[PDB]
């Protein structure tokens, strides 16, 4: 709660900055710090390895003004259908970023605000329970820092 929310905005703003665009950055606003970085690099290397797979993921969802949060959670469960894991999770963050980057290409920067929220809810009702039973995020940074 809250904490995870900060990570989203950070990861999002970061993914956007990579494409030139910008937004409410959060690299040194709240806390975490190490986590934000660990997750930042991870998402970068992750996509680099699975450039093909992920490419299909983003194509399995076209976020639009008339899109229900359900559709989103439906596409995020398929990945976590065979149990949750640090890696598969790292993708979730990347998935949200892609959808956002696409929302900006179609002149729709008012969606990123909604996408960020959707990720927060899904994180605090599907991943939070697990992350807590895996040594919190501190473990993710200690293993994949």
Ligand X SMILES: COC1(Cc2ccccc2)CCN(c2ccc(C(=O)NS(=O)(=O)c3ccc(NC(C)(C)CSc4ccccc4)c([N+](=O)[O-])c3)cc2)CC1
Min dist. Cβ of residue 47 to ligand X (A): 9
Q: Which residue has the CB atom at the shortest distance from ligand X?
A: 87
- Nearer to ligand X among residue 19 and residue 49 (C-beta): 49
- Nearer to ligand X among residue 23 and residue 54 (C-beta): 54
CA-to-CA separations, 133 to 11, 60, 84, 143, in angstroms, rounded? 23, 30, 11, 16
Min dist. Cβ of residue 110 to ligand X (A): 26
- Nearer to ligand X among residue 11 and residue 140 (C-beta): 140
Min dist. Cβ of residue 94 to ligand X (A): 9
Structure-token pair, residue 53: 């797979």
Min dist. Cβ of residue 109 to ligand X (A): 25
Min dist. Cβ of residue 65 to ligand X (A): 24
The helix or strand, by DSSP H or E, that contains position 72, with its residue range, turns out to be: helix 69-77
Angle at 103 between CA 102 and CA 109, to 5 degrees: 140
Nearest to 118 by CA among 69, 45, 53, 64: 69
- Nearer to ligand X among residue 57 and residue 120 (C-beta): 57
CA pair distance 95, 84, nearest whole angstrom:
15
CA pair distance 14, 26, nearest whole angstrom:
9
- Nearer to ligand X among residue 73 and residue 108 (C-beta): 73
Nearest to 63 by CA among 16, 24, 111, 15: 111
Interface with ligand X (CB under 6 A): 42, 45-46, 49-50, 53-54, 57, 78-79, 85-88, 90-91, 140, 144
């Amino acid at each position: 709660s809250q904490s995870n929310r900060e990570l989203v905005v950070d990861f999002l703003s970061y993914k956007l900055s990579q494409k030139g665009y910008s937004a409410g950055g959060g690299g040194g606003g709240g806390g975490m710090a190490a986590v934000k970085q660990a997750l930042r690099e991870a998402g970068d290397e992750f996509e680099l390895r699975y450039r093909r797979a992920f490419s299909d993921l983003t194509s399995q969802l076209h976020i639009t003004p008339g899109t229900a949060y359900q559709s989103f959670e439906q596409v995020v469960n398929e990945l976590f259908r065979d149990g949750v894991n640090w890696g598969r999770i790292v993708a979730f963050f990347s998935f949200g970023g892609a959808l956002c980057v696409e929302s900006v290409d179609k002149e729709m920067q008012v969606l990123v605000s909604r996408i960020a929220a959707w990720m927060a809810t899904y994180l605090n009702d599907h991943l939070e329970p697990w992350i807590q039973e895996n040594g919190g995020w501190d473990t993710f940074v200690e293993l994949y820092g």
